[PDB]
Design a binder for this molecule. Structure first.
Ligand SMILES: CCCCCCCCCCCCCC(=O)SCCNC(=O)CCNC(=O)[C@H](O)C(C)(C)COP(=O)(O)OP(=O)(O)OC[C@H]1O[C@@H](n2cnc3c(N)ncnc32)[C@H](O)[C@@H]1OP(=O)(O)O
Ligand SMILES: [Mg+2]
Length: 382
């Protein structure tokens, strides 16, 4: 393989073994003032997501043109309110919600975003951005619009004095810092089989399968309740302490922990364990991201929960994650998804998750370091 675009970028080569830790190139001290040129007939437009019409145009571009599974059966369906949670966290900047429109019709056909984040990578903490929501309309694919969108958001980030970034993708590019796998835990196996997310497995009847996946109707952990405003400080303390053990993690302020964890229905759920002394000792969290089931006459949507950050100090993680399943089931989810990062491999098989297809690769831009095992990746992105 060569990479016509990625070979020009300050990332390590696929196959180069990395022993050192540091930037790939030194920081730029004069940056290009003009936007990169789009192909004829298309124009940049910075999207004001606080305008409901504009946010709905972004909802529509992503609903019709964003990530599908490996078999072209399911497409993410991020909701407008979820996209406001994902894209306006503390420190968001309007120039970093970077849209491409057709000049004549004004139709939105491309987007890429950055949001700021402090990242801990081995022994270094650096201010970075997280790049997400790169999308080109299906009618514009394979025309090298993606390199323009990546160079343009690179420029706009460099203008604000930031020279590293973190991102994930399901394709292999120069050069993954860590390689993760999604696993899936059936909550509504009948629907999952029916829409062919799942198959009737290996000598089990549907009757047996529904039994195999049946869960308790209420969680078992004493003192589990939703996170409230008074818990913001201790959730922040728990998380900060917990993440020290991994090699790629976010460093969140208390304002960022309020944004990422405070519960918002149909977006983000966080439950804390408040013990018999009134102290919060653990928490679990998961976010809501349904998928469209394409071209299907009856079932139009699959409701999935995604494991976010789960912190245990007194409750065994196995038991916390069992309660997350019970909770997602009560909340009407069809499937609970989790990656094999952090300590998750200690529960995935025990709790009857099955491995999925594909991988999720993590990447750093303009930062060279040794790659790490999934168990040392402690960052989860939307
Ligand atoms: C300091 C600040 C730095 C900030 C920037 C940091 C870097 C951020 C990097 C981006 C992080 C994004 C994180 C997420 O959002 S990952 C989610 C990505 N989105 C989707 O999968 C949605 C559905 N697919 C699409 O919309 C398009 O197929 C996309 C837009 C993905 C590519 O459009 P198209 O298919 O029409 O292709 P092209 O002809 O224009 O371009 C072909 C070039 O693009 C390279 N390519 C393909 N897929 C990806 C990918 N996911 N990341 C990076 N590069 C990608 C490909 O290898 C080739 O380069 P090279 O092989 O020739 O070298
Ligand atoms: Mg293209």
């Amino acid at each position: 393989r060569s990479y016509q675009f990625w070979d020009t970028q300050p990332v390590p080569k696929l196959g180069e073994v990395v022993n050192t830790h540091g930037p790939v190139e030194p920081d730029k001290d004069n940056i290009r003032q003009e936007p990169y040129t789009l192909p004829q007939g298309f124009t940049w437009d910075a999207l004001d997501l606080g305008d409901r019409g504009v946010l709905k145009e972004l909802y529509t571009l992503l609903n019709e043109n964003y990530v599908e599974d490996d078999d072209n059966m399911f497409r993410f369906d991020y909701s407008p309110e979820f996209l406001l949670w994902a894209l306006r966290p503390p420190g968001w900047l309007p120039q970093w919600h970077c849209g491409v429109r057709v000049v004549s019709s004004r139709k939105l056909v491309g987007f890429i975003s950055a949001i700021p984040a402090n990242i801990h990578i081995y022994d270094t903490e650096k201010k970075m951005v997280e790049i997400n929501f790169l999308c080109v309309h299906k009618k514009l694919r394979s025309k090298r619009v993606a390199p323009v969108l990546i160079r343009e958001i690179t420029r706009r980030v460099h203008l604000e004095g930031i020279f590293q970034a973190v991102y994930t993708a399901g394709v292999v590019l120069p050069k993954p810092v860590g390689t993760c796998r999604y696993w899936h835990r059936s909550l509504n196996p009948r629907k999952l089989i029916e829409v062919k997310f799942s198959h009737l497995s290996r000598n089990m009847t549907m009757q047996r399968t529904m039994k195999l996946y049946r869960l308790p109707e209420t969680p078992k952990t004493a003192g589990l309740r939703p996170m409230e405003t008074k818990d913001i400080p201790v959730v922040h303390q728990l998380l900060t302490r917990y993440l020290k053990q991994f090699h790629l993690t976010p460093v969140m302020s208390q304002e960022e922990v309020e944004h990422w964890f405070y519960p918002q229905e149909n977006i983000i759920d966080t439950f804390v364990v408040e013990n018999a002394n009134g102290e919060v000792t653990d928490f679990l969290s998961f976010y809501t991201l349904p998928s469209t089931i394409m071209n299907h006459p009856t079932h139009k949507s699959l409701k999935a929960a995604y494991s976010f950050y789960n912190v245990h100090t007194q409750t065994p993680l196995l038991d916390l994650m069992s309660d997350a399943l019970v909770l997602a089931k009560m909340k009407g989810f069809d499937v609970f998804n989790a990656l094999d990062l952090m300590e998750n491999k200690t529960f995935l098989e025990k709790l009857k998750f099955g491995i999925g297809d594909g991988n999720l690769q993590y990447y750093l831009y303009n930062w060279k370091c040794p790659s790490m095992g999934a168990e040392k990746v402690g960052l989860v992105l939307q």
